[PDB]
Amino acid sequence: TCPFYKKIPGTGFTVDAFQYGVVEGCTAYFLTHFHSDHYAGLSKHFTFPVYCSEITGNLLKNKLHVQEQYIHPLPLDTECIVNGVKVVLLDANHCPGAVMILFYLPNGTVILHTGDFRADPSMERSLLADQKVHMLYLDTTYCSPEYTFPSQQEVIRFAINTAFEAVTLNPHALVVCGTYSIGKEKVFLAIADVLGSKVGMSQEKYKTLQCLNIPEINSLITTDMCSSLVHLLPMMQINFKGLQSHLKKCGGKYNQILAFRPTGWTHSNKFTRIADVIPQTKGNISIYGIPYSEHSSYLEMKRFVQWLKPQKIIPTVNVGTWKSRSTMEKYFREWKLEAGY
Ligand code: NI
DSSP, X not given: OOOGGGXXXXXXXXXXXXXXXXXXXXXXXXXXXXXXXXXXXXXXXXXXXXXXXXHHHHHHHHXXXXXXXXXXEXXXXXXXXXXXXXXXXXXXXXXXXXXXXXXXXXXXXXXXXXXXXXXXXXXXXXXXXXXXXXXXXXXXXXXXXXXXOOOHHHHHHXXXXXXXXXXXXXXXXXXXXXXXXXXXXXXXXXXXXXXXXXXXXXXXXXXXXXXXXXTTGGGTEESOSTXXXXXXXXXXXXXXXXXXXXXXXXXXXXSEEEEEEEXXXXXXXXXXXXXXXXXXXXXXXXXXXEEOOSSOOHHHHHHHHHHHOOSEEEEOSSOSSHHHHHHHHHHHHHHHHHHTO
16 A cells, blocks of 8 residues: 555645555645656556656656646746645756655645755755755665765766776777666766767667757767767676677677676775776676765765754655664664754
């Protein structure tokens, strides 16, 4: 059944709750972003109102074939009324189209649902600064102190410098980047830019990217693989067998592959820095795992919460085990005792 952490008290609203059939008492279904564990269940046969960002709306229309009459896009940073309740969509610094939602309940309670987010100090100067938030529905993906990772900027600097050096030493090397969802487009776009190439990809992935309102996108991507030396492939194909196979497909235009796997966290983060990352190599193929995260590190998450000072925190990730739930509640109490709220 729909879990309690997907329901907004005092409204008939749910958030990211499309896989339970008709939820008894739901008048509006919000969708924070276009990731499959969040949209799971949506299709052309859905006949209830969906509220979301413009970009998420483009993906629902073009990729899932949801009918236009049920898609309700809202602009960001704007007070809107939905079924008698004031709401605001805020940028979540996750993937394109991703939002946090502020609900202003008729009784005076204010609720923030973060969706999936990567907490940033810039959020401390949005509309959130303007009033008190009583309850917080929090992305707790990485809520443990072992989870450190570098800035997105640092990681893109490393990837750009690595690719540029490799291709300048060998003009017949191909760069491949893995993907299985929207998000992390900066990785392949930044590399293609330094090399003076467009990025080449399947027709399905090009269609997905043309939904995202990225400026000058027609100048940056293409379905012609031959004219491009940055290829995108399914994450599944980013291994030696898949990459050897792919190189055969290119008709001897290339003799070397340098590949990137933008992972979340991996336990080499606890020891190693970004400057010291090394690839796995077999033959003329090298594969780099780079820690490009679109979720809060532990310290980023802690700072945001200690700034916001909520009265109650509801986790939305890692909620399925008693050990995980108990651990998270310990951190929340530490944070509150240290900061004094
Ligand atoms: Ni997500």
